[PDB]
């Protein structure tokens, strides 16, 4: 690695120019192969420089300082490259010691809706570019869908919990800037059935293998058999799973059918032989009498009498021969039938106990996507897989909230301010917002451009919680409706004594029915303080939100009593139950690729809005409305870093739009 590793860590091909690079450097990528390699080195080196020390700003002057020949000979290039990297938040993003204190005066006015991670990331950047930036948060806190319960020594995340590998992750930079205690997650997850008894490693491993097998099977249906539409309706992963399960239960019976179908045929083959064997014993019984009688004619006898004895003798011994040969075949068919009845094929595909354990595995996948599998696009549910980060997963031992709160610092944030209407036109934008405490009291915000970081579920509200004037074009609103916005909830249980296996990070719980498979199916042991964290996924997600905390906490304890003992489980000192779907400022947990939607809609979400002209016939204006968020990013949806990168992305686009691109000239 080294310089090539820097590109990797920055999610870039080291030996090739990107599509965005082609856009900004159309001279170089259309130029000679030599120039490109120079560019690519400067790009890769500059990333390395910033990555080696992410806590301080990396200036152009500092970059050129540490470049060797011939790479430092073209200083216009070094400048162009640096500016590009700085503009698009590949370097000098997050929280760093600023070398040249912020520009004396500020250019352009930007209002950012929401101070979630995407919102802050764009705010910190647009401020870095010397713009006038104000964030309008509805909540009484920063972070949005990153929320840490802090009370006494108890620390627990109700929102973002995991860092999904540091390999290529922009969060890896932030973790070196902010104080993040990142603890590795031991992926060893024991399962426990309804009664509280552990699942034998025999079952565990065979069912899990079948799970992964069933998934590859659905892919075969999707890609190889093109089973993607059924009755004008798009096929969901949930459906394809059922199809594949049923096809397996079918085959189990077809194998049984053709096995007994094979017994009846051998059962017949014997009957036909037995009838023949009976009729032969009949003729032997008769031919014995004829021989017996002919033998009574005592010698001496004439030759025709002699012949009769000898002749009947032959005729009888020949028929005895046959019968012995037919009794030979009887013995063979007889043991062949004891062979088949001794060992049939597979009795069943999955027992009651098997299916319940497999349902847990589905609950896992329902949690992973924050939605019942019956909604996930069969073709595209996993489209974002290729971009997964390397390295093991980690949790923030001190709570993820250190990151928003860190980023928030130094920014004009208006908490308790609910944006009711966004108005964008040729000459600018106004934001109509109320105070969340006294709702009938109002604020008006004038700005050049608006960055909307409203959670998809908020953009989904019917009636609209935020109104767009003019209305968003049908392409954008169809994107909003096609796309899925899931739900996932957490029960925080704060104890002051660890009754669980401390070396185990997480343990599962197997529900009784498919209906309730995602109900408290998973528990996390992650924090310093004796805190267990229970997950409510799938269909259970939404239904449990209507049930009071006590009843929910009750069910948790009951489950835990089953595993650990009726008296080993005290009353928790503190409990928290998230209800993301019911929460007006999220209206769900995070997006997913719904059936009928695709990865393309995510791009449509990021696409900015250019208003119509004031005067009819006047020129097409500047883009005014911009969109950042976890739902606006094709390659990292539903993730903190995904959100982060969208904020980083949008800031760049907006700055380019309002401060001009120096690096392209």
């Amino acid at each position: 690695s080294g310089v090539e590793g820097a590109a990797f860590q920055s999610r870039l091909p080291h030996d090739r120019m990107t599509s965005q690079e082609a856009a900004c450097f159309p001279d170089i990528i259309s130029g000679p192969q030599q120039t490109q390699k120079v560019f690519l080195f400067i790009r890769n080196r500059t990333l390395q420089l910033w990555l080696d020390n992410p806590k301080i700003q990396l200036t152009f002057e500092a970059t050129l300082q540490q470049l060797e020949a011939p790479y430092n000979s073209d200083t216009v290039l070094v400048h162009r490259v640096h500016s590009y990297l700085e503009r698009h938040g590949l370097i000098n993003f997050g929280i760093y010691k600023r070398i040249k204190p912020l520009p004396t005066k500020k250019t352009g006015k930007v209002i950012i809706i929401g101070s979630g991670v995407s919102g802050l990331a764009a705010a910190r950047q647009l401020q870095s570019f010397g713009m006038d930036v104000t964030l309008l948060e509805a909540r009484d806190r920063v972070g949005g869908r990153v929320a840490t319960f802090r009370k006494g020594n108890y620390v627990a995340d109700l929102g973002a919990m995991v860092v999904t590998g540091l390999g290529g992750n922009p969060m890896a930079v932030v973790s070196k800037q902010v104080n993040m205690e990142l603890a590795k997650i031991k992926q060893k997850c024991p399962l426990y059935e309804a009664n509280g008894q552990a699942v034998p490693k025999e079952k565990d491993e065979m069912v899990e293998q079948e799970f992964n097998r069933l998934l590859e099977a659905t892919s075969y249906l999707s890609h190889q058999l093109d089973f993607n539409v059924l009755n004008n309706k798009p096929v969901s992963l949930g459906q394809a799973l059922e199809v594949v399960i049923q096809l397996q239960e079918k085959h189990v019976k077809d194998e049984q059918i053709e096995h007994w179908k094979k017994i009846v045929k051998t059962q017949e083959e014997l009957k036909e032989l037995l009838n023949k064997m009976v009729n032969l014993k009949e003729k032997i019984k008769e031919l014995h009498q004829q021989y017996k009688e002919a033998s009574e004619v005592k010698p001496p006898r004439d030759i025709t009498a002699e012949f009769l004895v000898k002749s009947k003798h032959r005729d009888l011994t020949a028929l005895c021969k046959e019968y012995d040969e037919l009794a030979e075949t009887q013995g063979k068919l007889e043991e062949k039938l004891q062979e088949l009845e001794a060992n049939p094929p597979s009795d069943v595909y999955l027992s009651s106990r098997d299916r319940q354990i497999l349902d847990w595995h589905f609950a896992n996948l329902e949690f992973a996507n924050a939605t019942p599998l019956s909604t996930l696009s069969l073709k595209h549910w996993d489209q974002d897989d290729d971009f997964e980060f390397t390295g093991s997963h980690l949790t923030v031992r001190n709570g993820y909230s250190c990151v928003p709160v860190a980023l928030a610092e130094g920014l004009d944030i208006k908490l308790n301010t609910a944006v009711r209407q966004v108005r964008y036109t040729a000459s600018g934008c106004e934001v109509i917002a109320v105070n969340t405490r006294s709702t009938s009291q109002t604020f008006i915000y004038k700005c050049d451009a608006v960055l909307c970081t409203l959670p998809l579920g908020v953009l989904k509200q019917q009636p609209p919680a935020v109104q767009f004037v003019p209305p968003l074009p049908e392409w954008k609103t169809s994107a909003v409706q096609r796309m899925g916005f899931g739900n996932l909830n957490k029960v925080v249980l704060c104890f002051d004594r660890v009754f669980w296996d401390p070396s185990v990070n997480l343990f599962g719980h197997v529900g009784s029915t498919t209906a309730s498979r995602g109900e408290l199916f998973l528990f996390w042991n992650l924090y310093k303080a004796p805190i267990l964290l229970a997950l409510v996924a799938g269909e259970a997600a939404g239904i449990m939100e209507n049930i009071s905390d006590d009843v929910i906490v009750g069910r948790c304890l009951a489950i835990l009593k089953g595993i650990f003992g009726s008296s080993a489980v005290p009353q928790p000192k503190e409990t928290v139950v998230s209800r993301w779907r019911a929460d007006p400022w999220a209206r769900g947990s995070y997006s997913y690729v719904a059936a009928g939607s695709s990865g393309n809609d995510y791009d449509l979400m990021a696409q900015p809005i250019t208003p119509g002209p004031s005067i009819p016939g006047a020129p097409q204006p500047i883009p005014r409305l911009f969109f950042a968020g976890e739902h606006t990013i094709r390659n990292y949806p539903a993730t903190v870093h995904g959100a982060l990168l969208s904020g980083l992305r949008e800031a760049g686009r907006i700055a380019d739009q309002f401060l001009g691109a120096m690096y392209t000239l």
């Binding site: 009484d140 806190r141 972070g143 929320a147 319960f149 802090r150 009370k151 109700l158 709570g399």
Partner: peptide
């Protein structure tokens, strides 16, 4: 009110 950060 609440203890969320």
């Amino acid at each position: 009110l609440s203890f969320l950060v």
